[PDB]
Design a protein around this ligand. Structure first.
Ligand SMILES: CC(C)CCC[C@H](C)NC(C)C
Ligand SMILES: CC(C)CCC[C@H](C)NC(C)C
Lengths: 133, 133
């Protein structure tokens, strides 16, 4: 099947992806069939970016697990860009549901406990709870 | 292991491949396990074409290193087919990263300095920077 190149990351994985000129941005690894383009080159993954829904073919070496959060979250970009805050909401919402996490009940106000959870290490599940399926 | 048949080219090598009826087209040697098809016959190599991401089993004797660039690049095809130009973009991008090369910030316009880097022997690394890993 897809992505059998001995590199990390499979379909459904929540990741940070790094494109030249941009901060690390959250994304989900997808099958090339979802992209309406072409099969990824060996060593690459198609990802779909949270916040804008676009697809990019990105080297596996330029991806890391979303669970390595406090290590790749860019606070300057977050303060500066509303699109980045939006991306984080959609990414962490996906993470939350997967981990079976719940928060008590505005964007910045919805984000706040989600960021704390993420930044704190995604407790109680830890990064294991972010896996697909 | 795979592709130990005494012939040239191993996994990850960037190459030109020639299929009957076509100009030389850029590709990367992959393991058969990436293809989701059969293992390659003796003397053959699975390649994945840049641009469309498809797989072909090609004789190892009908492949040449991407590094022999201007000899095999086909200017006429390039000007004629947008697919070829796209193929060149992806191939050179992969070459660029492996090399550690970088280009200051459209397709052709991004292609322009990449083609010139290639036609002029991939300086400063030369073709040694094109190797996998
Ligand atoms: C325009 C805004 C939504 C920010 C751009 C996000 C881009 C698509 N992700 C980059 C990592 C390539
Ligand atoms: C996209 C198309 C115009 C051609 C792309 C390369 C294919 C696979 N032909 C090669 C065998 C030379």
């Amino acid at each position: 099947s897809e992505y059998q190149d001995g590199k990390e990351f499979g379909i459904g994985d929540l990741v940070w992806g790094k494109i030249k000129g941009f901060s690390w941005w959250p994304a989900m690894v997808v099958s090339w069939k979802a992209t309406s383009k072409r099969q990824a080159m060996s060593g690459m993954r198609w990802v779909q970016w949270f916040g804008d829904g676009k697809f990019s073919e990105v080297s596996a070496d330029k991806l890391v697990a979303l669970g390595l959060f406090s290590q790749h979250f860019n606070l300057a970009t977050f303060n500066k860009l509303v699109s980045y805050r939006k991306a984080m909401y959609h990414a962490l919402e996906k993470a939350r549901v997967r981990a079976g996490k719940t928060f008590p009940s505005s964007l910045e106000d919805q984000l706040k406990p989600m960021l704390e959870w993420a930044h704190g290490g995604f407790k109680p599940t830890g990064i294991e709870g972010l896996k697909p399926n």
